[PDB]
Amino acid sequence: LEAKKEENLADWYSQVITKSEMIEYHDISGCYILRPWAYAIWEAIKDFFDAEIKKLGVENCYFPMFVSQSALEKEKTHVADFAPEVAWVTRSGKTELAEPIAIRPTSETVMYPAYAKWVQSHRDLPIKLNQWCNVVRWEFKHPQPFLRTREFLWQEGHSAFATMEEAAEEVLQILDLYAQVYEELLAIPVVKGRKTEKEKFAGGDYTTTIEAFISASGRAIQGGTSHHLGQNFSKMFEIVFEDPKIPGEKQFAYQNSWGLTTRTIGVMTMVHGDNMGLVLPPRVACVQVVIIPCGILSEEDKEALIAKCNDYRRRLLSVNIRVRADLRDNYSPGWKFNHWELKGVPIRLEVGPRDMKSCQFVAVRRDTGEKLTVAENEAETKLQAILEDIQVTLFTRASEDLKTHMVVANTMEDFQKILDSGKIVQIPFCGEIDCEDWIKKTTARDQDLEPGAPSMGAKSLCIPFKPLCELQPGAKCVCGKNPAKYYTLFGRSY
């Protein structure tokens, strides 16, 4: 890497994603190629989330990518929010279409006409569906690989229930899974919370979210969201049923929306990435251990050394360790070391002639760089132990970094100074869209930051379920105009 994370974050990130062979650029702005190395991380997330949502009775399906103008516009505030971000198809080949069709930014308006048909009685509920698909949003934002892309891969779950209580329970169940995806797969701590009125999903009653923190830039980012849509969509799409207990009266179904994207991968890079490259949490690493021959003798001797490497490979494969042996003749060991370091492989396994004769090998951790000499027979258990430990250290390091960078302020003045220290702050909040808009403008106007940093106002992240402090009985919004409703997390963001 030429660039350093502390010196220039953008250049560092740009170098990490390309040199790790995760991302390649496209000639369409905001669109990035997910090379195998990146894609494998997404596949690992998929394997885990899928198993978990199957336990909850959720089933996979595939809905069409195209939505009609009529369907898109059925729920009025939802379409109002998304109409500018929607890409329109207006012609096939040379023929203009009679009616333009929209690429889904989100599949509520695609799926709910089908839900209307399928729900004929109360027995038809609940309906729990999920799809893994691509979606396109032309947002007015600066695009960054993974974090903010014009096209993105995601999953979207859409559920429908007879009662609000049943729907409410699912929301938090999904939000916990997302937390698990971040915390125990990616070793990233998150803050569960409820979005404010201004930042909540258009068309839902309420939105839950997980917020992650990137130490380097001092900014927070949304990891995933789970919404309760109430009956806003069911009244518009006529997803209705007759309650046995309430004769002759049509009930509207209660609905939830939940989504998680390839943004995760960017967050993982920003949080754990270092100046030697990418750092993969062992849980999501395509390759957990890479075996490299050293000290390359006769043709027979070279073959035997290769055979030793491949035996290690077999041993690790048998204990469910994901392992590759880099046996290429064309690259020197040193080249290989750097290459795999750049890609963030958790463990490098070094094997030379002297080590083979001595019945030992060298393990090098990616997180710390600790070199360690292990006995040949203790390979499975020791490396398994090291991998388990790398995961904990990454999560531990990040948890400590989150803990100290999230603090409490009770004045606008206090809020400003801490924010400009590269921190996120829980403040007492009115909850009004006016309070929030004013804060955005003010935190930017009064901001004091380093010579390069551009003007960036703070926005709400979430109203935490578990705030650091309880709200003082008579406390007021930092604006001073009205009383505080809840402690709310605020910060610079994406």
Nearer to ligand W2H, 157 or 352 (CB): 157
**DSSP secondary structure letter of residue 250:** E
Instruction: For the CB of residue 93, give the shortest distance to its own copies in the complex, in Å.
Output: 4
CB 30 within 8 A of CB 249: no
308 in contact with ligand W2H (CB under 6 A): no
| Residue 110 binds which entry of its own copies, ligand W2H, none, CB below 5-8 Å type-dependent | its own copies
CA distance linking residue 453 with residue 298, whole number of Å: 58
148 in contact with ligand W2H (CB under 6 A): yes
63-79: b or e for each residue (b if 16 or more CB lie within 10 Å)?
A: bebebeeebbbbbeebb
Q: Which of 161, 201, 340, 415 binds ligand W2H (CB under 6 A)?
A: 201
Which region, judged by CB under 8 A, interacts with its own copies, from 37-45, 182-190, 343-351, 397-405?
37-45
| Residue 258 binds which entry of ligand W2H, its own copies, none, CB below 5-8 Å type-dependent | ligand W2H
Nearer to ligand W2H, 16 or 210 (CB): 210
E strands, 173-272, are 191-194, 206-214, 219-230, 240-242, 250-252, 254-261
CA distance linking residue 346 with residue 125, whole number of Å: 46
Cα separations (Å) of 26 from 32, 33, 76, 144, 151?
6, 7, 35, 13, 12
Cis status of the peptide bond prior to 126, with omega within 30 of 0: yes
Instruction: For the CB of residue 355, give the shortest distance to its own copies in the complex, in Å.
Output: 28
Nearer to its own copies, 136 or 321 (CB): 136
Find the radius of gyration of the CA atoms of the chain: 26
112 in contact with ligand W2H (CB under 6 A): no
CA distance linking residue 162 with residue 252, whole number of Å: 8
CA distance linking residue 456 with residue 444, whole number of Å: 5
92 in contact with its own copies (CB under 8 A): yes
Q: Which of 51, 90, 248, 450 binds its own copies (CB under 8 A)?
A: 90
C-alpha angle 72-73-78 in degrees, rounded to nearest 5: 85
Which region, judged by CB under 6 A, interacts with ligand W2H, from 96-104, 219-227, 308-316, 392-400?
219-227
Contact characters 39-78, its own copies, x per CB under 8 A: xx-xx---------------xxxxxxxxxx-xx-------
261 in contact with ligand W2H (CB under 6 A): yes
Q: Residue 373: what residue type?
A: T
The residue number with the shortest CB distance to ligand W2H is 259
Q: What would the two tokens of residue 51 be?
A: 């198993």
442-451: b or e for each residue (b if 16 or more CB lie within 10 Å)?
A: bbeeebebee
Nearer to ligand W2H, 288 or 493 (CB): 493
CA distance linking residue 177 with residue 491, whole number of Å: 24
| Residue 43 binds which entry of its own copies, ligand W2H, none, CB below 5-8 Å type-dependent | its own copies
CB 489 within 8 A of CB 426: yes
104 in contact with ligand W2H (CB under 6 A): no
Per CB under 8 A, which of residues 14..33 are in contact with its own copies?
24, 26-28, 31-33
CA distance linking residue 345 with residue 148, whole number of Å: 25
Which region, judged by CB under 8 A, interacts with its own copies, from 108-116, 175-183, 231-239, 467-475?
108-116
Binding site for ligand W2H (CB under 6 A): 106, 108, 137, 139, 148-149, 152, 156, 201, 224-225, 227, 257-259, 261, 263
Binding site for its own copies (CB under 8 A): 24, 26-28, 31-36, 39-40, 42-43, 59-68, 70-71, 83-95, 101, 103, 110, 113-114, 117-118, 123, 129, 133-134, 136, 138, 150-151, 153, 330-331
